[PDB]
Amino acid sequence: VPAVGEDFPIDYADWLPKRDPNDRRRAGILLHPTSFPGPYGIGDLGPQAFKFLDWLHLAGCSLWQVLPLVPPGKRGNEDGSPYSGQDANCGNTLLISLEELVDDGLLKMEELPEPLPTDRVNYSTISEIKDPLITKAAKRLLSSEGELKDQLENFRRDPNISSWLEDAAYFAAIDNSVNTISWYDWPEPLKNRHLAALEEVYQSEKDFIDIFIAQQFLFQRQWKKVRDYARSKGISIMGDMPIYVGYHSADVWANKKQFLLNRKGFPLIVSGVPPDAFSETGQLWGSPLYDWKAMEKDGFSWWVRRIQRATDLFDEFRIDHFRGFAGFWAVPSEEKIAILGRWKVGPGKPLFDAILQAVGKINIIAEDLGVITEDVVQLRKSIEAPGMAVLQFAFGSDAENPHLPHNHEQNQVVYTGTHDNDTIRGWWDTLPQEEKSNVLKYLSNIEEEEISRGLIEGAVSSVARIAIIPMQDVLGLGSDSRMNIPATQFGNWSWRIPSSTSFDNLDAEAKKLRDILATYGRL
Amino acid sequence: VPAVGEDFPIDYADWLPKRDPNDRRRAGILLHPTSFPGPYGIGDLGPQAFKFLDWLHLAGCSLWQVLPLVPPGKRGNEDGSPYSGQDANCGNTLLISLEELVDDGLLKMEELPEPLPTDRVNYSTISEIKDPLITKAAKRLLSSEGELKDQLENFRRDPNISSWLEDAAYFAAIDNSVNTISWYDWPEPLKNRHLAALEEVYQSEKDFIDIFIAQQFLFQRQWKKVRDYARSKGISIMGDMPIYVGYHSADVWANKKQFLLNRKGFPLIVSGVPPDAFSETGQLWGSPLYDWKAMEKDGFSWWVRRIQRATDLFDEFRIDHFRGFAGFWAVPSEEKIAILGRWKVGPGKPLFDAILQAVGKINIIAEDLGVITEDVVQLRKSIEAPGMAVLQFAFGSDAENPHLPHNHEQNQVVYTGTHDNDTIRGWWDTLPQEEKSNVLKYLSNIEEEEISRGLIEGAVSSVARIAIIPMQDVLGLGSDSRMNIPATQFGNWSWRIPSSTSFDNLDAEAKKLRDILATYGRL
Ligand SMILES: OC[C@@H]1C[C@H](O)[C@@H](O)[C@@H](O[C@H]2[C@H](O)[C@@H](O)[C@@H](O[C@H]3[C@H](O)[C@@H](O)[C@@H](O[C@H]4[C@H](O)[C@@H](O)[C@@H](O[C@H]5[C@H](O)[C@@H](O)[C@@H](O[C@H]6[C@H](O)[C@@H](O)[C@@H](O[C@H]7[C@H](O)[C@@H](O)[C@@H](O[C@H]8[C@H](O)[C@@H](O)[C@@H](O[C@H]9[C@H](O)[C@@H](O)[C@@H](O[C@H]%10[C@H](O)[C@@H](O)[C@@H](OC%11[C@@H](CO)O[C@H](O)[C@H](O)[C@H]%11O)O[C@@H]%10CO)O[C@@H]9CO)O[C@@H]8CO)O[C@@H]7CO)O[C@@H]6CO)O[C@@H]5CO)O[C@@H]4CO)O[C@@H]3CO)O[C@@H]2CO)O1
Ligand SMILES: OC[C@@H]1C[C@H](O)[C@@H](O)[C@@H](O[C@H]2[C@H](O)[C@@H](O)[C@@H](O[C@H]3[C@H](O)[C@@H](O)[C@@H](O[C@H]4[C@H](O)[C@@H](O)[C@@H](O[C@H]5[C@H](O)[C@@H](O)[C@@H](O[C@H]6[C@H](O)[C@@H](O)[C@@H](O[C@H]7[C@H](O)[C@@H](O)[C@@H](O[C@H]8[C@H](O)[C@@H](O)[C@@H](O[C@H]9[C@H](O)[C@@H](O)[C@@H](O[C@H]%10[C@H](O)[C@@H](O)[C@@H](OC%11[C@@H](CO)O[C@H](O)[C@H](O)[C@H]%11O)O[C@@H]%10CO)O[C@@H]9CO)O[C@@H]8CO)O[C@@H]7CO)O[C@@H]6CO)O[C@@H]5CO)O[C@@H]4CO)O[C@@H]3CO)O[C@@H]2CO)O1
Ligand SMILES: [Ca+2]
Ligand SMILES: [Ca+2]
């Protein structure tokens, strides 16, 4: 620009305010792919994934949120949980479409099971039915010599893929063969990764390891087709990364120095949260904790790889318990409750600077719920990450409750509720009378019969640049359709869109969402 | 904070997010004091000012906005206009309360006029009635020897006051005696401020000048009592400063080098705005323009003093045509239309840095309406000034219209409408059918009979930290109560609260506003 008082160019008034496309207002639907309908006991990355994306596009949604896509819990008290991953980087092979494998010629139509009961995932039977079919497809791929074989070889040898996949495959092979509760009790040559012991595992467990890798390839190829189709329809996919990983995983076993373990590989201190204004007990989670000091010394190489894999799967993703990056609660591993721990200093912004330097700009959503400290807020703003608002948490205190729409900010994500909340209708049904009248006053004395439209419109009309609705709320469902009740160990993660509902029968629901997206500028 | 991975103090979780009191959510009423009811032809800084502040406090409002308090236009085509000030720094003596002067013993009850017609200010008769009474009070003060005389002497000699008041008094005295259209035609010794000519003006015009100063003192003392009472009730007063001043003023005559004048004191270039997407002609305003280059050389001393006087009157204030600080439209003074001008580079942030250094933090509101350029937005954010949203401008384009609530930001001021807009009911009455249905869809298909509650609630429920309602909208008034129709020359600035309405009869209106302030967190 010229000197003060001098002429601007003739065209000055054409220099209109800049609108960063990273600020675009968007709406999305939360729907885990297990919840897709179909005849094979669980949703998959097949025909219904494309039908869903067409319905999202018809509704004018530009985002799809999923839970972690990792191989879930197999213990009887977390069966199907996306948050009890066996591995941080692998894909859940139960999401592999039997129909897409028939198209590939890796399965025969004849080998597909007869139609299975359609309304809920049965996690105690689904692996016994699908696992042998996915294994069969992986064996046919390994013995083939065409296009798909070449792609498998390119995947296997890719430096980003092999950096997690080799360790995950050998871990699964040793776990399968040794079958102790944890790698802490493996024979010393396997526990401490003797080069010679690992070469002998590949000799004795070759078919297990090649099959494990081919299954991860079949997942990768299906997911990339879904993500390519999403992008073709203007849809971004938002994933979900828990800050911590499980002890019994390749993540810890093949990267022991990244964690605070004693000399025998047992965790010194484990994760949780202390008591606060809302909890008398706090929570003992019991994950191992990162050696953030040793990580800083190698430029956070372990976290950089974890983020690289996440950007391979997702356009953007939430980090659960984001506050752990500023400060984290650490319980001595011998303790049975949360109270006896201490706050430690998290890595803060340098972790994010190292990620930006190695991977470039990533779109992270900070899960920043509950009682957090000013350093958490400062860290989040310093990296310009959006936090979360959840409307189901907004109406039970006073007008300073940060979840109320007049307290929202532009760089934020607003939900009606997450996978951890009841549906809007279920929440409403158990809500005290005093909170209900408070909800109805706030939404400008709207009628109680319209609570769902009320909360959906309250999320969509927010200044928050992303609004997310659970699919259950679009379908008008009650408590029977809740994805998770926190701290219960049965009937979670099993909700599916019922057989009587199909995406081609949801035109009215699409139109109703699209009209409010148009009004509130999210198209 | 300690090293990464080390212990935080035991009290870590007590360090809750910081809430800057400069971010507090607040509501205010726009009401120019001329609009106060009472028996003397115009509102004043007397009993009704205190009654209004009590009603604001009962309604839970924490802000009161006024128009400029300067001595207004006396030409027949801008009679009463606060935006045709005779002076940037003086107070309008017509706002002086005859009743407060009786309390002081400067007027006798017997000298007050009989009750005058109460519903509209008559600008063609009000000066002839009040001027002689305020003059009488000023003469009694000048001949007195008590408390008020001492305060007058302290006011007169105050370095901040004398820096504008002496020039304003001598200007008014010469203007009164010489009586040309402008100071451009004054005799050379008065036009060019010969020291000897100015000493002779004080000899020959002593009573005019002493009276002018005593009147400014009586204004100052009344206004400070209003502002002290406001503060006692938790009310901030927001004023209004036009960026430009008038040519025929002490502001220009006593500060010629601050302006772009030729060697005879005639403006080289004058203010306006060029054509844009919304105007074929643009506007020729015709004020003189600042020599921003020469101002930078003395640390913007003229602007610093203007801001010092404004903070003497107001807690915070709007600057009209804030965009002039980044870039300003300059028309050669010989031209009769706006098209033939040029954009010049405004002073930008250094003006604001010099103000911060000399006066400390000030709360400025940027009037940033219409087509503005990215440099205007950049300047506003660089000084963290709030811009404006106006709901009457929100519903006539598409969903990207910045006045719609989903586009508001926290650091912003939202109005239903300003003194330049019709009332909500008047605007609604002339609004096209297509815009009306658009308004009703946006506010979630609210009933047309409730448009006023709809727009008031839409301003109060905004994320904007300040919401302002015109008093006319609280009283449910139509187009007959509009304060100004831009570019008309009759019947403007004359609306008063009618004689049948009193602040003690407005309890229901106070309660109705207070309840929505409570719901949307502005108490
Ligand atoms: O031991 C134990 C056992 C054993 C072991 O160890 C373990 O592990 C376990 O186990 C196991 C099990 O068993 C099984 O079951 C399985 O599991 C599982 C599960 O179950 C499931 O669920 C899953 O999970 C997962 C999930 O899904 C995912 O998602 C994830 O999660 C996680 C996350 O991520 C993280 O982060 C965490 O979270 C959490 C947290 O931490 C905590 O904290 C909590 O939070 C919460 C809270 O509590 C509540 O309350 C809510 O909140 C809210 C509220 O409500 C509202 O209201 C709002 O707030 C606010 C307000 O409003 C305002 O007002 C403010 O306040 C304040 C005030 O102002 C002032 O004045 C003061 O005050 C007070 C008062 C107040 O009230 O009070 C009283 O009176 C007193 O006196 C005073 O003081 O202050 C205050 C404060 O400061 O503010 C506020 C704030 O803003 O809002 C909020 C929100 O935001 O909500 C929340 C929620 O968030 O909780 C949570 C939880 O949820 O964690 C999690 C976990 O948990 O992940 C997960 C995990 O993974 O999965 C799994 C499966 O696998 O398994 C196992 C084995 O392996 O057991
Ligand atoms: O010559 C002449 C003559 C003479 C001389 O010289 C002069 O002076 C004169 O005079 C005198 C007179 O006569 C008497 O009467 C007296 O006076 C006076 C008056 O009357 C009164 O009134 C008073 O005044 C005062 C007042 O009161 C105060 O207040 C102050 O004022 C001022 C201020 O401060 C400043 O600032 C200024 O203002 C202005 C401006 O400048 C301009 O511009 C304008 O504006 C406006 C506009 O125009 C309208 O239109 C509205 O707007 C809005 C809209 O509507 C909405 O819609 C929104 O917008 C937005 C949208 O929505 C979106 O969409 C966007 O747009 C865009 C788009 O997107 C794209 O696409 C593009 O496009 C286009 C299309 C569009 O439409 O079109 C077409 O088609 C094409 O083709 C294309 O292009 O682009 C676009 C754009 O860029 O965006 C947008 C934006 O955002 O919103 C908006 C808003 O914001 O509104 C506005 C309003 O603002 O106007 C204004 C005015 O009003 O100035 C003023 C003044 O004027 O001060 C004043 C003064 O002082 O007082 C006085 C008394 O004294 O006197 C004398 C003697 O002395 O005559
Ligand atoms: Ca086992
Ligand atoms: Ca004259």
mmCIF file with all atom_site columns, C-alpha atoms in Angstrom, chain A residues 1-10 12-19 25 292-293 323 326-328 342-348 371-377 399-400 404-410 441-445 453 457 460-463 515 518-522, chain B residues 1-10 12-19 25 292-293 323 326-328 342-348 371-377 399-400 404-410 441-445 453 457 460-463 515 518-522:
data_model
loop_
_atom_site.group_PDB
_atom_site.id
_atom_site.type_symbol
_atom_site.label_atom_id
_atom_site.label_alt_id
_atom_site.label_comp_id
_atom_site.label_asym_id
_atom_site.label_entity_id
_atom_site.label_seq_id
_atom_site.pdbx_PDB_ins_code
_atom_site.Cartn_x
_atom_site.Cartn_y
_atom_site.Cartn_z
_atom_site.occupancy
_atom_site.B_iso_or_equiv
_atom_site.pdbx_formal_charge
_atom_site.auth_seq_id
_atom_site.auth_comp_id
_atom_site.auth_asym_id
_atom_site.auth_atom_id
_atom_site.pdbx_PDB_model_num
ATOM 1   C CA . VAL A 1 1   ? 0.000   0.000   0.000  1.00 0.00 ? 1   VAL A CA 1
ATOM 2   C CA . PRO A 1 2   ? 1.276   3.579   -0.725 1.00 0.00 ? 2   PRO A CA 1
ATOM 3   C CA . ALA A 1 3   ? 2.342   6.250   1.824  1.00 0.00 ? 3   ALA A CA 1
ATOM 4   C CA . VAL A 1 4   ? -0.317  7.776   4.159  1.00 0.00 ? 4   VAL A CA 1
ATOM 5   C CA . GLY A 1 5   ? -2.334  10.464  2.264  1.00 0.00 ? 5   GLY A CA 1
ATOM 6   C CA . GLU A 1 6   ? -1.217  9.297   -1.229 1.00 0.00 ? 6   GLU A CA 1
ATOM 7   C CA . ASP A 1 7   ? -3.563  7.843   -3.891 1.00 0.00 ? 7   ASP A CA 1
ATOM 8   C CA . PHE A 1 8   ? -4.665  4.187   -3.750 1.00 0.00 ? 8   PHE A CA 1
ATOM 9   C CA . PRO A 1 9   ? -4.986  2.439   -7.141 1.00 0.00 ? 9   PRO A CA 1
ATOM 10  C CA . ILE A 1 10  ? -8.268  3.140   -9.083 1.00 0.00 ? 10  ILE A CA 1
ATOM 11  C CA . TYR A 1 12  ? -9.196  -0.043  -4.443 1.00 0.00 ? 12  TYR A CA 1
ATOM 12  C CA . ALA A 1 13  ? -12.894 -0.836  -3.789 1.00 0.00 ? 13  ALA A CA 1
ATOM 13  C CA . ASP A 1 14  ? -12.587 -4.270  -5.575 1.00 0.00 ? 14  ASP A CA 1
ATOM 14  C CA . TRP A 1 15  ? -10.349 -5.532  -2.644 1.00 0.00 ? 15  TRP A CA 1
ATOM 15  C CA . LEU A 1 16  ? -13.432 -7.050  -0.785 1.00 0.00 ? 16  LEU A CA 1
ATOM 16  C CA . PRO A 1 17  ? -13.036 -8.880  2.576  1.00 0.00 ? 17  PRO A CA 1
ATOM 17  C CA . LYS A 1 18  ? -11.153 -12.253 2.327  1.00 0.00 ? 18  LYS A CA 1
ATOM 18  C CA . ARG A 1 19  ? -13.231 -15.439 3.154  1.00 0.00 ? 19  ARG A CA 1
ATOM 19  C CA . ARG A 1 25  ? -19.901 -23.301 7.434  1.00 0.00 ? 25  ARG A CA 1
ATOM 20  C CA . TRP A 1 292 ? 6.853   -36.804 26.377 1.00 0.00 ? 292 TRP A CA 1
ATOM 21  C CA . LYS A 1 293 ? 10.436  -35.757 27.351 1.00 0.00 ? 293 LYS A CA 1
ATOM 22  C CA . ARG A 1 323 ? -6.534  -31.570 27.474 1.00 0.00 ? 323 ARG A CA 1
ATOM 23  C CA . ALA A 1 326 ? -1.437  -29.425 28.179 1.00 0.00 ? 326 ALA A CA 1
ATOM 24  C CA . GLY A 1 327 ? -1.698  -31.451 31.415 1.00 0.00 ? 327 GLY A CA 1
ATOM 25  C CA . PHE A 1 328 ? -2.500  -35.113 32.181 1.00 0.00 ? 328 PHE A CA 1
ATOM 26  C CA . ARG A 1 342 ? -0.835  -36.087 40.119 1.00 0.00 ? 342 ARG A CA 1
ATOM 27  C CA . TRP A 1 343 ? -1.082  -33.632 37.198 1.00 0.00 ? 343 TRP A CA 1
ATOM 28  C CA . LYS A 1 344 ? 1.967   -33.739 34.864 1.00 0.00 ? 344 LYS A CA 1
ATOM 29  C CA . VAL A 1 345 ? 2.956   -31.089 32.282 1.00 0.00 ? 345 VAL A CA 1
ATOM 30  C CA . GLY A 1 346 ? 1.919   -32.196 28.742 1.00 0.00 ? 346 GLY A CA 1
ATOM 31  C CA . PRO A 1 347 ? 4.134   -31.478 25.691 1.00 0.00 ? 347 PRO A CA 1
ATOM 32  C CA . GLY A 1 348 ? 2.047   -28.443 24.573 1.00 0.00 ? 348 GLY A CA 1
ATOM 33  C CA . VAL A 1 371 ? -13.708 -29.018 33.839 1.00 0.00 ? 371 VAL A CA 1
ATOM 34  C CA . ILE A 1 372 ? -10.544 -27.897 31.978 1.00 0.00 ? 372 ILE A CA 1
ATOM 35  C CA . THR A 1 373 ? -7.877  -25.386 32.961 1.00 0.00 ? 373 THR A CA 1
ATOM 36  C CA . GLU A 1 374 ? -6.843  -22.100 31.293 1.00 0.00 ? 374 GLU A CA 1
ATOM 37  C CA . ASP A 1 375 ? -3.634  -23.772 29.877 1.00 0.00 ? 375 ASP A CA 1
ATOM 38  C CA . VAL A 1 376 ? -5.910  -26.196 27.885 1.00 0.00 ? 376 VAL A CA 1
ATOM 39  C CA . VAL A 1 377 ? -7.843  -23.231 26.380 1.00 0.00 ? 377 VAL A CA 1
ATOM 40  C CA . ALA A 1 399 ? -26.750 -18.542 31.094 1.00 0.00 ? 399 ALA A CA 1
ATOM 41  C CA . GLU A 1 400 ? -22.884 -18.714 31.280 1.00 0.00 ? 400 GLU A CA 1
ATOM 42  C CA . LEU A 1 404 ? -25.697 -22.531 25.055 1.00 0.00 ? 404 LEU A CA 1
ATOM 43  C CA . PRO A 1 405 ? -25.760 -21.070 21.477 1.00 0.00 ? 405 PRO A CA 1
ATOM 44  C CA . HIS A 1 406 ? -25.214 -17.414 22.614 1.00 0.00 ? 406 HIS A CA 1
ATOM 45  C CA . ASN A 1 407 ? -21.839 -18.628 24.087 1.00 0.00 ? 407 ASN A CA 1
ATOM 46  C CA . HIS A 1 408 ? -20.720 -20.505 20.895 1.00 0.00 ? 408 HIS A CA 1
ATOM 47  C CA . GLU A 1 409 ? -17.795 -19.210 18.821 1.00 0.00 ? 409 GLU A CA 1
ATOM 48  C CA . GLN A 1 410 ? -17.122 -19.478 15.093 1.00 0.00 ? 410 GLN A CA 1
ATOM 49  C CA . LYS A 1 441 ? -37.948 -20.958 27.260 1.00 0.00 ? 441 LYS A CA 1
ATOM 50  C CA . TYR A 1 442 ? -34.465 -20.797 25.631 1.00 0.00 ? 442 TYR A CA 1
ATOM 51  C CA . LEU A 1 443 ? -35.588 -22.043 22.158 1.00 0.00 ? 443 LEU A CA 1
ATOM 52  C CA . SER A 1 444 ? -38.279 -19.255 22.407 1.00 0.00 ? 444 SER A CA 1
ATOM 53  C CA . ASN A 1 445 ? -41.172 -21.278 23.952 1.00 0.00 ? 445 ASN A CA 1
ATOM 54  C CA . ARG A 1 453 ? -36.473 -29.905 15.284 1.00 0.00 ? 453 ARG A CA 1
ATOM 55  C CA . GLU A 1 457 ? -32.195 -26.110 14.383 1.00 0.00 ? 457 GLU A CA 1
ATOM 56  C CA . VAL A 1 460 ? -27.599 -25.669 12.586 1.00 0.00 ? 460 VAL A CA 1
ATOM 57  C CA . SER A 1 461 ? -28.367 -21.911 13.355 1.00 0.00 ? 461 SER A CA 1
ATOM 58  C CA . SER A 1 462 ? -25.219 -21.688 15.640 1.00 0.00 ? 462 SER A CA 1
ATOM 59  C CA . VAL A 1 463 ? -22.222 -19.483 14.677 1.00 0.00 ? 463 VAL A CA 1
ATOM 60  C CA . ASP A 1 515 ? -33.904 -26.465 3.862  1.00 0.00 ? 515 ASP A CA 1
ATOM 61  C CA . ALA A 1 518 ? -29.947 -23.354 3.226  1.00 0.00 ? 518 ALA A CA 1
ATOM 62  C CA . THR A 1 519 ? -31.531 -20.882 5.763  1.00 0.00 ? 519 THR A CA 1
ATOM 63  C CA . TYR A 1 520 ? -28.518 -20.974 8.155  1.00 0.00 ? 520 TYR A CA 1
ATOM 64  C CA . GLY A 1 521 ? -25.845 -20.773 5.436  1.00 0.00 ? 521 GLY A CA 1
ATOM 65  C CA . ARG A 1 522 ? -24.365 -24.376 5.627  1.00 0.00 ? 522 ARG A CA 1
ATOM 66  C CA . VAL B 1 1   ? 4.911   -23.917 34.446 1.00 0.00 ? 1   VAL B CA 1
ATOM 67  C CA . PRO B 1 2   ? 7.431   -26.769 35.133 1.00 0.00 ? 2   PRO B CA 1
ATOM 68  C CA . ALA B 1 3   ? 9.359   -28.867 32.555 1.00 0.00 ? 3   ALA B CA 1
ATOM 69  C CA . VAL B 1 4   ? 7.408   -31.276 30.266 1.00 0.00 ? 4   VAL B CA 1
ATOM 70  C CA . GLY B 1 5   ? 6.561   -34.512 32.189 1.00 0.00 ? 5   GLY B CA 1
ATOM 71  C CA . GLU B 1 6   ? 7.234   -33.002 35.664 1.00 0.00 ? 6   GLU B CA 1
ATOM 72  C CA . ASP B 1 7   ? 4.567   -32.507 38.374 1.00 0.00 ? 7   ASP B CA 1
ATOM 73  C CA . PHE B 1 8   ? 2.192   -29.516 38.268 1.00 0.00 ? 8   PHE B CA 1
ATOM 74  C CA . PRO B 1 9   ? 1.312   -27.997 41.670 1.00 0.00 ? 9   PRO B CA 1
ATOM 75  C CA . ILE B 1 10  ? -1.442  -29.854 43.672 1.00 0.00 ? 10  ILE B CA 1
ATOM 76  C CA . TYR B 1 12  ? -3.566  -27.254 39.061 1.00 0.00 ? 12  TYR B CA 1
ATOM 77  C CA . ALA B 1 13  ? -7.308  -27.885 38.480 1.00 0.00 ? 13  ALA B CA 1
ATOM 78  C CA . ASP B 1 14  ? -8.256  -24.573 40.272 1.00 0.00 ? 14  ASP B CA 1
ATOM 79  C CA . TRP B 1 15  ? -6.697  -22.585 37.304 1.00 0.00 ? 15  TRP B CA 1
ATOM 80  C CA . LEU B 1 16  ? -10.157 -22.319 35.508 1.00 0.00 ? 16  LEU B CA 1
ATOM 81  C CA . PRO B 1 17  ? -10.528 -20.484 32.147 1.00 0.00 ? 17  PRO B CA 1
ATOM 82  C CA . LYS B 1 18  ? -10.018 -16.653 32.373 1.00 0.00 ? 18  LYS B CA 1
ATOM 83  C CA . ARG B 1 19  ? -13.141 -14.462 31.596 1.00 0.00 ? 19  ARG B CA 1
ATOM 84  C CA . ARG B 1 25  ? -22.321 -9.632  27.471 1.00 0.00 ? 25  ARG B CA 1
ATOM 85  C CA . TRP B 1 292 ? -2.800  12.723  8.077  1.00 0.00 ? 292 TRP B CA 1
ATOM 86  C CA . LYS B 1 293 ? 0.898   13.070  7.032  1.00 0.00 ? 293 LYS B CA 1
ATOM 87  C CA . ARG B 1 323 ? -13.328 2.914   7.213  1.00 0.00 ? 323 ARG B CA 1
ATOM 88  C CA . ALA B 1 326 ? -7.813  2.800   6.404  1.00 0.00 ? 326 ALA B CA 1
ATOM 89  C CA . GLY B 1 327 ? -8.864  4.575   3.182  1.00 0.00 ? 327 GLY B CA 1
ATOM 90  C CA . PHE B 1 328 ? -10.975 7.679   2.444  1.00 0.00 ? 328 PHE B CA 1
ATOM 91  C CA . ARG B 1 342 ? -9.937  9.170   -5.520 1.00 0.00 ? 342 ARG B CA 1
ATOM 92  C CA . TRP B 1 343 ? -9.205  6.808   -2.604 1.00 0.00 ? 343 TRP B CA 1
ATOM 93  C CA . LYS B 1 344 ? -6.369  8.041   -0.327 1.00 0.00 ? 344 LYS B CA 1
ATOM 94  C CA . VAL B 1 345 ? -4.423  5.952   2.226  1.00 0.00 ? 345 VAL B CA 1
ATOM 95  C CA . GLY B 1 346 ? -5.728  6.611   5.789  1.00 0.00 ? 346 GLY B CA 1
ATOM 96  C CA . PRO B 1 347 ? -3.348  6.772   8.795  1.00 0.00 ? 347 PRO B CA 1
ATOM 97  C CA . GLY B 1 348 ? -4.146  3.185   9.942  1.00 0.00 ? 348 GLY B CA 1
ATOM 98  C CA . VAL B 1 371 ? -19.172 -2.128  0.975  1.00 0.00 ? 371 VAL B CA 1
ATOM 99  C CA . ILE B 1 372 ? -15.783 -1.995  2.773  1.00 0.00 ? 372 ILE B CA 1
ATOM 100 C CA . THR B 1 373 ? -12.397 -3.348  1.730  1.00 0.00 ? 373 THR B CA 1
ATOM 101 C CA . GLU B 1 374 ? -10.193 -6.014  3.367  1.00 0.00 ? 374 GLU B CA 1
ATOM 102 C CA . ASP B 1 375 ? -7.800  -3.271  4.728  1.00 0.00 ? 375 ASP B CA 1
ATOM 103 C CA . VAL B 1 376 ? -10.773 -1.852  6.771  1.00 0.00 ? 376 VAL B CA 1
ATOM 104 C CA . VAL B 1 377 ? -11.446 -5.315  8.302  1.00 0.00 ? 377 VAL B CA 1
ATOM 105 C CA . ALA B 1 399 ? -27.374 -16.668 3.927  1.00 0.00 ? 399 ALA B CA 1
ATOM 106 C CA . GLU B 1 400 ? -23.848 -15.081 3.669  1.00 0.00 ? 400 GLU B CA 1
ATOM 107 C CA . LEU B 1 404 ? -27.753 -12.550 9.959  1.00 0.00 ? 404 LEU B CA 1
ATOM 108 C CA . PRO B 1 405 ? -27.205 -13.919 13.533 1.00 0.00 ? 405 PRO B CA 1
ATOM 109 C CA . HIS B 1 406 ? -25.370 -17.119 12.372 1.00 0.00 ? 406 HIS B CA 1
ATOM 110 C CA . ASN B 1 407 ? -22.709 -14.750 10.841 1.00 0.00 ? 407 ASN B CA 1
ATOM 111 C CA . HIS B 1 408 ? -22.303 -12.581 14.018 1.00 0.00 ? 408 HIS B CA 1
ATOM 112 C CA . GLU B 1 409 ? -19.068 -12.698 16.032 1.00 0.00 ? 409 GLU B CA 1
ATOM 113 C CA . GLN B 1 410 ? -18.471 -12.187 19.748 1.00 0.00 ? 410 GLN B CA 1
ATOM 114 C CA . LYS B 1 441 ? -38.598 -18.542 7.980  1.00 0.00 ? 441 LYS B CA 1
ATOM 115 C CA . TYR B 1 442 ? -35.271 -17.399 9.542  1.00 0.00 ? 442 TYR B CA 1
ATOM 116 C CA . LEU B 1 443 ? -36.710 -16.643 13.041 1.00 0.00 ? 443 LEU B CA 1
ATOM 117 C CA . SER B 1 444 ? -38.186 -20.229 12.832 1.00 0.00 ? 444 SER B CA 1
ATOM 118 C CA . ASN B 1 445 ? -41.650 -19.422 11.348 1.00 0.00 ? 445 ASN B CA 1
ATOM 119 C CA . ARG B 1 453 ? -40.305 -9.639  19.958 1.00 0.00 ? 453 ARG B CA 1
ATOM 120 C CA . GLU B 1 457 ? -34.911 -11.584 20.764 1.00 0.00 ? 457 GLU B CA 1
ATOM 121 C CA . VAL B 1 460 ? -30.444 -10.290 22.474 1.00 0.00 ? 460 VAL B CA 1
ATOM 122 C CA . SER B 1 461 ? -29.786 -14.070 21.705 1.00 0.00 ? 461 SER B CA 1
ATOM 123 C CA . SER B 1 462 ? -26.821 -13.123 19.361 1.00 0.00 ? 462 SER B CA 1
ATOM 124 C CA . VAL B 1 463 ? -23.204 -14.063 20.259 1.00 0.00 ? 463 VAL B CA 1
ATOM 125 C CA . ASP B 1 515 ? -36.433 -11.847 31.317 1.00 0.00 ? 515 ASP B CA 1
ATOM 126 C CA . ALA B 1 518 ? -31.596 -13.275 31.867 1.00 0.00 ? 518 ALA B CA 1
ATOM 127 C CA . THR B 1 519 ? -32.204 -16.166 29.352 1.00 0.00 ? 519 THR B CA 1
ATOM 128 C CA . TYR B 1 520 ? -29.482 -14.977 26.903 1.00 0.00 ? 520 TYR B CA 1
ATOM 129 C CA . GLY B 1 521 ? -26.873 -14.168 29.572 1.00 0.00 ? 521 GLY B CA 1
ATOM 130 C CA . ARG B 1 522 ? -26.832 -10.274 29.365 1.00 0.00 ? 522 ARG B CA 1
#
